[PDB]
Ligand binder design. Structure first.
Ligand SMILES: CCN(C(=O)CO)[C@H]1CN(/C(=N/C#N)Nc2cccc(OC(F)F)c2)N=C1c1ccc(Cl)c(Cl)c1
Ligand SMILES: C[S@@+](CC[C@H](N)C(=O)[O-])C[C@H]1O[C@@H](n2cnc3c(N)ncnc32)[C@H](O)[C@@H]1O
Ligand SMILES: [Zn+2]
Ligand SMILES: [Zn+2]
Ligand SMILES: [Zn+2]
Length: 426
């Protein structure tokens, strides 16, 4: 950092520019989390302060509902954990703020405790975050209002608040600039604010990838970067077609991408691969599958909220059956449901069924994603741990090696995950 600088990039509000070349694999900069939270389902598995996984975690005696490496982690998290420690007890069962409210509460405590610029904000301050307030519709304002309501309700014991308009601003800023922290398998660990990382604008063919080392964000080049060019990361999963991606970006971030990918659209035809039946299906038909697919994707978002693994699995198979009438297995809509089914299979400790979906998914992933992709890497990694688990040592070794090859670029040669995975090549 300083190796680069900010600049008021066109059509793009602000963004980040290289002053020097970066090679593939190079660490552009890193950014300690300004605020963060460990996701509720990872309670008991990871330290709430540093996010390390441990079998042996010391508990908060106070509320017996937060876990730490040791008394230093616990002490260091206290200022934040105190926002939730006693209210979890008053509320018990009914303590259930969204992750966004939990993160936003910590921002507010941070601003109070440390109003000045932090090391997390060398180029973009939290106070300066784009909010797109003027673009939010009733629905999005309504959701933020719920969030404000929840915040007051749950965090009043030890937090005071600013007026409503300031809060609406803050929550909008959070949606526009908040990150998720995910592990080596892209499992959700929590959410965070990385202000200097958030200065980076998006591309569907990014030249950098963002990874996490505990709660520290790191940014590395996945294409060579020339002096004067804009540093772009991806805000979304790059698997989907150009339309599906831009619906996402406009909805979450109020812009339409004009990157080479979203322009030429060169990868679209392959993502929507169609089966060759002596007499093909006509276009009418296709639309009805495509619409049926996305539609389903939205409906599967749901059943996770409550349905049995047995019955989530069931919908994946039926949807795949139907869909395959006209879609090839290499088709992304087929890959989505395969992926989701693989997730279900892993939750049931159904290793072999997880493995079958994995094997069908990986080769299309490599086609559809770019050269260095956390999605491809985490799929190889999952394949390799499944093979090793069934004692297919040779295939496991090969798959774990493919993940390492990507991760060395994206996470760095010395990342602790690499170290873990190398030991596993055994
Ligand atoms: C898929 C890649 N992303 C990751 O965060 C990867 O770790 C997206 C996804 N994204 C968010 N998703 C969610 N949820 N951010 C987010 C959005 C709303 C709220 C939120 O935190 C909540 F706790 F407040 C976090 N935010 C992302 C993101 C990526 C790059 C940049 Cl520069 C920024 Cl500002 C956001
Ligand atoms: C995390 S911010 C990036 C920093 C932002 N450009 C700024 O000055 O605050 C997310 C926002 O930046 C803008 N942005 C990012 N990538 C863009 C792109 N490719 N084209 C246009 N605007 C973009 C969008 O307004 C987006 O919601
Ligand atoms: Zn506690
Ligand atoms: Zn710790
Ligand atoms: Zn694009």
């Amino acid at each position: 950092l300083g190796g680069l600088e900010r600049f008021c990039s066109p059509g793009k509000g602000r963004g980040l520019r290289a002053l020097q070349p970066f090679q593939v694999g190079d660490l552009l900069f890193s950014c300690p989390a300004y605020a963060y939270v460990l996701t509720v389902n990872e309670r008991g598995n990871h330290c709430e302060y540093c996010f390390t996984r441990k079998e042996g975690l010391s508990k908060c005696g106070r509320c017996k509902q937060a876990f730490y490496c040791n008394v230093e982690c616990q002490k260091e998290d206290w200022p934040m954990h105190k926002l939730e420690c006693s209210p979890m007890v008053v509320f018990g069962e009914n303590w259930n703020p969204s992750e966004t409210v939990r993160l936003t509460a910590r921002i507010l405590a941070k601003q109070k405790i440390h109003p000045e610029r932090t090391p997390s904000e060398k180029l973009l301050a939290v106070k300066e975050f784009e909010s797109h307030l003027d673009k939010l519709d009733n629905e999005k304002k309504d959701l933020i209002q719920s969030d404000i309501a929840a915040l007051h309700h749950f965090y009043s014991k030890h937090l005071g608040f600013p007026d409503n308009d300031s809060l609406v601003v803050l929550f909008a800023q959070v949606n526009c600039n908040g990150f998720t922290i995910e592990d080596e398998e892209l499992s959700h660990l929590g959410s965070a604010i990385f202000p200097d990382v958030a200065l980076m604008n998006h591309s569907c063919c990014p030249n950098v990838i963002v990874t996490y080392k505990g709660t520290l964000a790191e940014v590395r080049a996945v294409q060579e970067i020339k002096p004067g060019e804009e540093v772009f990361t991806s805000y979304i999963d790059l698997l989907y077609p150009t339309e599906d991606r831009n619906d996402r970006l406009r909805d979450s971030y109020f812009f339409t991408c004009e990157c080479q990918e979203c322009t030429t659209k060169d990868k679209d035809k392959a993502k929507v691969e169609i089966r060759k039946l002596s007499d093909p299906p006509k276009a009418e038909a296709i639309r009805d599958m495509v619409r049926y697919a996305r539609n389903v994707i939205e409906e599967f978002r749901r059943a996770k909220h409550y349905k049995s693994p047995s019955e989530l699995l069931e919908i994946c198979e039926l949807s795949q059956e139907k869909m395959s009438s006209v879609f090839e297995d290499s088709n992304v809509y087929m890959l989505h449901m395969m992926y989701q089914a693989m997730g279900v299979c892993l939750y049931m400790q159904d290793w072999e069924g997880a493995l079958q979906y994995g094997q069908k998914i990986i080769k299309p992933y490599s086609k559809h994603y770019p050269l260095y992709s956390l999605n491809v890497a985490s799929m190889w990694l999952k394949l390799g741990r499944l093979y090793m688990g069934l004692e297919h040592k040779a295939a496991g070794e090969k798959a774990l090696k493919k993940a390492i090859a990507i991760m060395e670029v994206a996470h760095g040669k010395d990342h602790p995950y690499i170290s873990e995975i190398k030991q596993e090549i055994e």
